[PDB]
Write an enzyme that holds these catalytic residues in place. Structure first.
Site: not given
Ligand SMILES: C1=Cc2ccccc2C1
Ligand SMILES: [Cl-]
Ligand SMILES: [Cl-]
Length: 162
Positions: A11, A20
């Site tokens: 991440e 994202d």
């Protein structure tokens, strides 16, 4: 290696609202704030999560606090899921980490269409499951990350992460 380190690598860490891989407003270590296109909605979600007027920016400490909450939530979710729990309970500790990574990334609901892979995993048919997992939107969209998680299930080791 562990779940926290494993997800931190997959991440990354950003202290300012970002988008994202799917274009959703996120911050910290993969913490999705909202699906809505409104940055303001995203900033409001942010303040609500942090408990302060953040202005779209948080501290490292704050990022890590969200991460912990999200790690916990995920495990707890798997454990309450009747379709998931049993699979997860059959697994060894390394593979469990892999199963949390998936839920963390895509939600309980995202991991739904994985029935056939679930079953193979439960059956301990590693190579076949590895193949089945790759036949998915997830794999096509985030291939490098998917290969890591897949290797982890296939091998039961942290090699992909080393
Ligand atoms: C992908 C495999 C698996 C197994 C148990 C719980 C959750 C997951 C997600
Ligand atoms: Cl929250
Ligand atoms: Cl990727």
């Amino acid at each position: 290696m562990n779940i926290f380190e494993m997800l931190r690598i997959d991440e990354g860490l950003r202290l300012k609202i970002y988008k994202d891989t799917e274009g959703y407003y996120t911050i910290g270590i993969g913490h999705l704030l909202t699906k809505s296109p409104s940055l303001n909605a995203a900033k409001s979600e942010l303040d609500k999560a942090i408990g302060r007027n953040t202005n779209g920016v948080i501290t490292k400490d704050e990022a890590e606090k969200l991460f912990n909450q999200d790690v916990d939530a995920a495990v707890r979710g798997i454990l309450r899921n009747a379709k998931l729990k049993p699979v997860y309970d059959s697994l060894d500790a390394v593979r469990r980490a892999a199963a949390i990574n998936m839920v963390f990334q895509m939600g309980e609901t995202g991991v739904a269409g994985f029935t056939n892979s679930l079953r193979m995993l439960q059956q301990k048919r590693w190579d076949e499951a590895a193949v089945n997992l790759a036949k998915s939107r997830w794999y096509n969209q985030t291939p490098n990350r998917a290969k890591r998680v897949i290797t982890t299930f296939r091998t039961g080791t942290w090699d992909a992460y080393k």
